[PDB]
Design a protein around this ligand. Structure first.
Ligand SMILES: [Mg+2]
Ligand SMILES: [Mg+2]
Ligand SMILES: [Zn+2]
Ligand SMILES: [Zn+2]
Ligand SMILES: [Zn+2]
Ligand SMILES: [Zn+2]
Lengths: 162, 162
DNA sequence: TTGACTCTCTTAAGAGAGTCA
DNA sequence: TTGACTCTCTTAAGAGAGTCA
């Protein structure tokens, strides 16, 4: 809600509830042929999810609290960042999973960045493979690799140069 | 159905027409602090665009030919790949700009790959910076770099471990 | 047959808000 | 007040199809 105290109270209540989610150990590529372990705090697959939580999409949830007798609601991963600017260079800030695990609500696996920065982590070589993200990746992106391109650049005649 | 010969004729007329688009010289990062040059064949900003071409969106065009009284139409960047498979690993193939210049129709700047592979090139370090794409990038992706993350992983209490 | 417009759709990383009990 | 559902939206890489003369 409006006051800093009320916002801290929201974050604290969210942390307490999420802190009781099941802790799931995930072994992940780090890049450079190395592997690490992440501890994700995973929201349940079906109701009940936890106090204040409700599912608005297949992998979308919202956190809800009643403050000043009114309902205040946020995207479930946005709550750690309620005291942060909501935009950067005119682009909306988004909650961004460093563990690439949407059910995870561990705030140590979340950052707050443009949707472009968010997406780009999917292809990052990872913290041991050359990640240059200023807020460092926790793992190699799930889509990192050579790709599966069907056809490369080509011409039939002689009209073009690279 | 169009025969192989008719499809080749479509590709050839498309190449003829695109080859008359203005050729614009761009200096681009290759990764590793090196600079290179790309020569883009850029569709005009406004009508007329060239024989067979029409704009269906701000940065979307289509190519149209009428063959034996039947109107055929294709996405304007898909024509080089009409003799290729249209899907791979269960995913639709998409025209993918290696030059990241949507107006460019240079087929030496295009490849044919999944939308995920396509998107991921935006963050690639480039052919001189560590590109691992099997069909190699022509330049460092425009979004490569440290990013502009507003807030990193953080907790107010002690409920979580990474 | 052709040009120049019009409209909506897909994907996978993210969102806001309403209807009931 | 709290829970459990419903709906559509945003973005930036890509698409398909209709109307009229
Ligand atoms: Mg993400
Ligand atoms: Mg692209
Ligand atoms: Zn996690
Ligand atoms: Zn990274
Ligand atoms: Zn180009
Ligand atoms: Zn690459």
């Amino acid at each position: 809600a409006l006051t800093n105290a009320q916002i801290l109270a929201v974050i604290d209540s969210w942390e307490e509830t999420v802190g009781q989610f099941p802790v799931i150990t995930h072994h992940v590529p780090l890049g450079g042929g190395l592997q690490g372990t992440l501890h994700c705090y995973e929201i349940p697959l079906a109701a009940p999810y936890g106090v204040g939580f409700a599912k608005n999409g297949p992998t979308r949830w919202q956190y809800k609290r009643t403050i000043n007798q009114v309902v205040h609601r946020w995207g479930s991963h946005t709550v750690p960042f309620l005291l942060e600017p909501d935009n950067i260079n005119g682009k909306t800030c988004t909650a961004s999973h460093l563990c690439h695990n949407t059910r995870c609500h561990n705030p140590l696996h979340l950052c707050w960045e443009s949707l472009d920065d968010n997406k780009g982590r999917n292809w990052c070589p990872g913290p041991n493979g050359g990640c240059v993200h200023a807020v460092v990746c926790l793992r190699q992106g799930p889509l990192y690799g050579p790709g599966a391109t069907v056809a490369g650049p080509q011409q039939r005649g002689s009209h073009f140069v690279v």
